[PDB]
């Protein structure tokens, strides 16, 4: 997966079973069983990277909406209330996006 030589692919795929069902996803959660709790700053940054399709240097809500994708294409959508819960969690500043600073402070929150 797109994590190889950063994340464990067995706690990936717990991470997912965890939230499978509609509305479950809670980041605390989910990072902490995806393995990325303890990650250095360099490789935190390699999966914001990921996840900021679009190059902007911030996770905006879209991107969040398709966080899980990012572990596996097959995964689900958030649903609208999933994704502005974890939105208002990690945009530490309230500017209505997520740079890289703060996704790894909510990770190690
Ligand atoms: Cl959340
Ligand atoms: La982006
Ligand atoms: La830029
Ligand atoms: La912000
Ligand atoms: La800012």
Request: charged share 35%; glycine share 20%; net charge negative.
């Given at each position: 997966g797109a994590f190889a030589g950063i994340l464990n692919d067995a706690d990936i795929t717990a991470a997912l079973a965890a939230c499978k069902?509609?509305?479950?996803?809670?980041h605390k959660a989910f990072f902490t069983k995806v393995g990325?709790?303890?990650?250095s700053p360099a490789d935190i940054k390699k999966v914001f990277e990921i996840i900021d399709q679009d190059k902007s240097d911030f996770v905006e809500e879209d991107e969040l909406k398709l966080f899980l994708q990012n572990f596996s294409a097959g995964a689900r959508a958030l649903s609208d209330a999933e994704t502005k819960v974890f939105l208002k969690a990690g945009d530490?500043?309230?500017?209505?996006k997520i740079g890289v600073d703060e996704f790894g402070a909510m990770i190690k929150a």
């Open positions: 069902a509609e509305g479950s996803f809670d990325l709790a303890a990650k530490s500043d309230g500017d209505g």
